[PDB]
Amino acid sequence: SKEYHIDEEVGFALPNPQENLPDFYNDWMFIAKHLPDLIESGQLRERVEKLNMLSIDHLTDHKSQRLARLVLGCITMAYVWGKGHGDVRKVLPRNIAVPYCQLSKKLELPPILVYADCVLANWKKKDPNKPLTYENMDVLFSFRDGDCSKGFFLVSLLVEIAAASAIKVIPTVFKAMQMQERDTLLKALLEIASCLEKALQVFHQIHDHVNPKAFFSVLRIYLSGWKGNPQLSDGLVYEGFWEDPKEFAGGSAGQSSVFQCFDVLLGIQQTAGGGHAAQFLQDMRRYMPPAHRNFLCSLESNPSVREFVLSKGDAGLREAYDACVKALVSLRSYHLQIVTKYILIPASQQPEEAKGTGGTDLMNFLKTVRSTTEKSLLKE
Ligand code: HEM
Ligand SMILES: Cl[C@H]1CCCC[C@H]1CNc1cc(Br)cc2[nH]ncc12
């Protein structure tokens, strides 16, 4: 609905994101749109230090506030990581830390670039009378020339949007169950699986828009956070807002609400039996917009789809359920192949880790999540 801020077309993505700020903030917008040139020239920190503190008060509506979060988060990652080879700043200047943390407190997000910034709000249509396809879209911000951030973020978005075509169906699932409407339940489950299967096919475009070296040695550096990170082992000082430094985890698709939400729907015990996997995915919910965090706990308050299906001795209903689970398994198995190409192999070619968001061991995290999904199948 509108209380959960779910768009009928793009789901959890911010529909038609704002591309321009109020003239007042032109000195934010100039740095953010020139992070590649400004980083390469050793000038980015300077241009940021030369800024004046700006009030967040001329950011009147939600889309303005979301764009500014994106601006400031990207600037913050540029400031902290610099050229991306290990010369890092552990203090973020008040002229930026302060409106960043104010705007953040307002939107109930942490003061760091999150998935909802750099994917869900970091896009535009080129031509608005053409649909949501890669050739009709661009991102609004990048970090370095050749970082494949347009590829990574838009392919990420297009998989989101495809998967979000199944959110539509969730109220049908629970109404069907409450109304003991066997046939519509089953058709609804089959439709959710069709959407998750299409999402996998969209994922296949990753290879054309991202290459391994750029992802592993550049993009991944600028998405990284300061939680569990030796390079900023105590956190980052938000000068002029908080006294001590604070840890926050980097961007992660574990912050995506669509995939968490099909784990909840299908009763895959992703945030439960654990343990590292489940605690991580629970933590990442505090990096989601508040209404999206609240959709997820609302789903959890509904009766279990899994228990309903398990208890019915109905082989077609079990197949439809399994078809949804299987689709999550196929997505996650494909995803580990991508993690092999874009992380593990480049990692091997360097003069067992390489960590993962918030310090995690990432192969174990992803294999545990996949295994948990596979073992939710009712039949092999
Ligand atoms: C170069 C491409 C990609 C790489 C290297 C990659 C890597 C990773 C890694 C290392 C994790 C572990 C969690 C973390 O450390 O933050 C992760 C989690 C995740 N990634 Fe990706 N990813 C890529 C693209 C995508 C895309 C396009 C999707 C869209 C479906 C995606 C969906 C997810 C999800 C949902 C999770 C949470 C784990 C789960 O639900 O199974 N990733 N990804
Ligand atoms: Cl590799 C790991 C640890 C090092 C920093 C980068 C994270 C992955 N972060 C992601 C960010 C976004 Br946006 C979207 C993502 N999809 N899948 C993974 C992911």
Curated annotation (Swiss-Prot):
Cofactor note as given: Binds 1 heme group per subunit. In the active form, the heme iron is in its ferrous state Fe(+2). The catalytic cycle does not alter the oxidation state of the heme, but IDO1 is prone to autoxidation.
Top EC category: oxidoreductase
Reported regulation of activity: Activity is inhibited by and MTH-trp (methylthiohydantoin-DL-tryptophan), modestly inhibited by L-1MT (1-methyl-L-tryptophan) but not D-1MT (1-methyl-D-tryptophan).
Gene Ontology biological process terms, A to Z: 'de novo' NAD biosynthetic process from L-tryptophan; female pregnancy; inflammatory response; kynurenic acid biosynthetic process; L-tryptophan catabolic process; L-tryptophan catabolic process to kynurenine; multicellular organismal response to stress; negative regulation of interleukin-10 production
Tagged with keyword S-adenosyl-L-methionine: no
InterPro entries per UniProt: Indolamine_dOase (IPR000898), Trp/Indoleamine_2_3_dOase-like (IPR037217)
Pathways per UniProt: Amino-acid degradation; L-tryptophan degradation via kynurenine pathway; L-kynurenine from L-tryptophan: step 1/2
Compartments, as annotated in UniProt: Cytoplasm, Cytosol
Any GO CC annotation of this UniProt entry: smooth muscle contractile fiber
Gene3D superfamilies, A to Z: 1.20.58.480
Disulfide bonds: none
Tissue: Expressed in mature dendritic cells located in lymphoid organs (including lymph nodes, spleen, tonsils, Peyers's patches, the gut lamina propria, and the thymic medulla), in some epithelial cells of the female genital tract, as well as in endothelial cells of term placenta and in lung parenchyma. Weakly or not expressed in most normal tissues, but mostly inducible in most tissues. Expressed in more than 50% of tumors, either by tumoral, stromal, or endothelial cells (expression in tumor is associated with a worse clinical outcome). Not overexpressed in tumor-draining lymph nodes.
CC cofactor: heme b
Family according to the record: Belongs to the indoleamine 2,3-dioxygenase family.
Remaining remarks: IDO1 is the target for therapy in a range of clinical settings, including cancer, chronic infections, autoimmune and allergic syndromes, and transplantation. IDO1 and IDO2 are 2 distinct enzymes which catalyze the same reaction. IDO2 affinity for tryptophan is much lower than that of IDO1. 50% of Caucasians harbor polymorphisms which abolish IDO2 enzymatic activity. IDO2 is expressed in human tumors in an inactive form: tryptophan degradation is entirely provided by IDO1 in these cells. IDO2 may play a role as a negative regulator of IDO1 by competing for heme-binding with IDO1. Low efficiency IDO2 enzymes have been conserved throughout vertebrate evolution, whereas higher efficiency IDO1 enzymes are dispensable in many lower vertebrate lineages.
Name used for this protein in its record: Indoleamine 2,3-dioxygenase 1
Organism: Homo sapiens (Human)
Gene: IDO1
